Design an enzyme around this catalytic site. Structure first.
Site: not given
Ligand SMILES: *C(=O)[C@@H](NC(=O)[C@H](NN1CCN(CC)C(=O)C1=O)c1ccccc1)[C@@H]1N[C@@H](C(=O)O)C(C)(C)S1
Ligand SMILES: *C(=O)[C@@H](NC(=O)[C@H](NN1CCN(CC)C(=O)C1=O)c1ccccc1)[C@@H]1N[C@@H](C(=O)O)C(C)(C)S1
Lengths: 433, 438
Positions: A43, A46, A264
């Site tokens: 992420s 972004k 995020s």
């Molecule tokens: C950016 O890094 C975002 N991370 C995630 O969206 C991550 N999402 N995933 C990972 C696995 N898949 C595959 C299909 C998903 O559906 C998906 O959307 C995720 C989501 C929840 C928990 C861990 C990882 C966003 N940024 C992260 C960050 O560290 O800033 C989050 C956790 C805030 S979500």
């Protein structure tokens, strides 16, 4: 330089780190470890979308959802279609769409005559987002092991959930996941099992056919308003020429970017990404179009991407490939140009807000309240991209990508204790250097 | 040790290498560069699958596809249901399904009273559901005629032997609009494909290869077309019950046995064979409908009792397609040794592709000259950005060298350009010459 190699020594075996930091005041790289390897940004991607939106879209930009028609309004009558224009507002609520449908009364429309036409112009989020485009179902899993779990779909969701999920004889709340396959028209099939659970609960789900989800919702909506619609639903592929009857406007760029960055939010990133293309290029927007337009625009500012791969706006995709130092370079553009872009405020703040209020390795002095960073996460990936102030009140940009991080099964991501020790010592050293 | 780090200067900027090599004769590691970093293995992962299969399936393994009934053959009719059993055979053809069904005639049957029951237990065509019911790789060919003027609608041609429906309104774009086109394929229920977008005017026939999405429907429709052409009458329902089905065995198709399956999977890198075997291994070892996560546990466990240590590897699949795979070169190396050491019982060495002679390296540029040609054998792995080799060679002193090479992060262009292999060819030519001379 700082000795990063020493630090990675306690990240789990087999992981790889990419770390680089520049003291903006001294104009000097003070850490540089695999600084040039392509890795998954997650992420932190972004950051790029932020800066690109700023440049190509500007502060006055807003997402527009719009009612239109070519019909002559008669008496209560609308003698043409209702075209409903969606442009990817990632923020749009059911609430706000209803309110937009309301402007149809106040204008005298009792009965819409023709069809309901839905307009789209991008090629997890789409043209028609409503309520983060997701929903939940209600599971009752307080049954016997080996016995079906009862599932309900709140009435407010135009969804089916069929299939059948038995209860897990704990003789096997290991050998067990929950398979979900989608079928035409938001019919979701479920399989496998769960472990016995006492309370009732919610399974959340993305909406797959968002077009159809949104035409269904709209029709519940014209009914609740007493507007008589009896037509079809057309999902044309072209923009639809009509007369502006009414419109709804998102919050504007700075709020959008503030939410994306602090929290995020993927949908803001990936809709902005594509909005950037639609505007730079003046035509329906793919992700590829989005790559072209975001590189081109950061390239007009002197950002060099090499053969970086920028596959989406949010950095979810496993095809993204970028090096710390290219992320690093975009940050320095941010700091240098702060006076004009006001992107510094969007970064979460260590132990204070957004995605790193409680981040383990950042919540002591001297990093608590000091270190700001866009975070990034996937399974096996933990990143921080951002800024801080060191012992001399000097500014320091950094980029920490960690990939292939792994300590445990499919059954759960295991301990973060090495991550937390790593970042703690890492940022402490940047401070102290 | 070999200074692999200098050879990496030849790869595109960004990329990462993991390289490790043991000289088996001496028991000496002679290259160790990111030997421990987990990376994407790609198709080299079928090396794990091949060993787990030799050990649990064994050389006499064949996949079964079978006709059964609860009915009785009486006076011209099967009085009861036709059960058709599918167990993942990835090579099954329309033609062999046909002869299998014709065994029904031969047995006196010209009409079936009951329904057709299918039994189980497990866009483009390289991935393809390796599902319980595979017919012609679950894969069909459409032909797009876009040899037409800007503006016109592209003719889509489905050959008639496929029970699918491709439809939609692609149009031809002028060369102005032309670089902006997307062609895409939306998958709707019961094998119906909607194709949207445009393409540039075309001056050959454009082909689409689609993966069948609903394999069970696919097979059922085919079986009905085949009973009709066989002049066996049938008027019943098509049922898909999800549990195993009982019946007296009326007839059984057997695939080629495992050594053939393995030779083809290793030499030519067949994804379906790998993902099919990955699951047969689970079914047989755990005796229960089998999924990828069960495949994962079983392969890990079969190899473990042989001394392979996985630590926190993630083996997401049998074929290594998945980008969730994580395994460290050194881990690949121990499987290689284990394969060279027990060659008398396993015979996997002959399945490895042979530099300049056969398999996926018969034309591998970095390997085409001596002393590598006819010397190096190796399984390739490839994905966008990934270029790997796992194998053996004889060095200058005639001793055996086992090596593993993972390259990830390889990018020389816009995300949809033809990657340039010249850096790869260089780096491989140099690496393998070092291993030969070392
Ligand atoms: C950016 O890094 C975002 N991370 C995630 O969206 C991550 N999402 N995933 C990972 C696995 N898949 C595959 C299909 C998903 O559906 C998906 O959307 C995720 C989501 C929840 C928990 C861990 C990882 C966003 N940024 C992260 C960050 O560290 O800033 C989050 C956790 C805030 S979500
Ligand atoms: C193993 O590495 C195999 N690689 C591929 O199949 C590979 N990539 N694919 C096919 C599956 N999907 C599904 C979405 C992909 O997106 C994808 O990347 C591939 C296929 C064709 C061309 C290049 C890469 C097989 N092994 C390879 C080898 O080098 O031995 C191949 C090229 C022989 S395929």
């Amino acid at each position: 330089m700082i000795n990063v190699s020493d630090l990675t020594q306690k990240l789990p075996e087999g992981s790889n780190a990419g770390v680089i930091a520049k003291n903006i005041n001294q104009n000097q790289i003070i850490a540089d470890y695999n600084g040039s390897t392509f890795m998954l940004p997650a992420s932190t991607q972004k950051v790029f979308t932020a800066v690109a939106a700023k440049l190509a879209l500007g502060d006055q930009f807003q997402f527009e959802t719009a009612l239109l028609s070519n019909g002559k309004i008669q008496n209560g009558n609308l003698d043409g279609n209702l075209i409903v224009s969606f442009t990817g507002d990632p923020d749009l609520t059911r609430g706000q769409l209803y309110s937009l449908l309301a402007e149809l009364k106040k204008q005298g429309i009792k009965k819409i005559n023709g069809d309901l036409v839905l307009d789209t112009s991008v090629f997890p989020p789409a043209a028609a987002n409503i309520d983060n485009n997701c929903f939940y179902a209600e599971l009752d899993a307080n049954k016997n092991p080996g016995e079906i779990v009862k599932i309900n779909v709140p009435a407010q969701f135009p969804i089916q959930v069929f299939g059948q999920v038995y209860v897990a004889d704990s003789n096997e709340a290991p050998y067990c996941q929950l398979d979900v396959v989608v079928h035409d028209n938001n019919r979701y099939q479920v399989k496998g099992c769960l472990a016995r659970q006492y309370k009732p609960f919610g399974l959340s789900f993305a909406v797959q056919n968002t077009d159809a989800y949104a035409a269904a919702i709209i029709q519940r909506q014209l009914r609740k308003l007493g507007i008589e619609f009896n037509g079809k639903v057309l999902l044309p592929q072209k923009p639809q020429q009509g007369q502006l009857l009414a419109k709804h406007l998102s919050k504007p760029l700075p709020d959008l970017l503030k939410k994306m960055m602090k929290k995020s939010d993927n949908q803001i990133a990936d809709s902005l990404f594509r909005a950037v293309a639609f505007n730079y290029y003046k035509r329906p927007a793919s992700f590829q179009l989005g790559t072209l337009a975001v590189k081109s625009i950061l390239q007009k500012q002197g950002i060099r991407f090499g053969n970086s791969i920028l596959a989406d706006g949010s950095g979810l995709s496993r095809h993204n490939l970028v090096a710390p130092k290219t992320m690093l370079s975009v940050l320095e553009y941010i700091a240098k140009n702060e006076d004009k872009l006001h992107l510094m405020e969007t970064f979460p703040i260590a132990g204070v807000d957004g995605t790193i209020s409680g981040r383990g390795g950042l919540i002591s002095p001297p990093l608590v309240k000091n270190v700001i960073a866009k975070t990034g996460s996937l399974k096996g990936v933990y990143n921080l991209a951002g800024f801080m102030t060191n012992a001399r009140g000097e500014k320091v940009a950094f980029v920490q990508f960690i990939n292939g991080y792994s300590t445990g099964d499919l059954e759960s991501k295991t301990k973060r204790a090495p991550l937390v020790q790593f970042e703690r010592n890492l940022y402490n050293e940047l401070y102290k250097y």
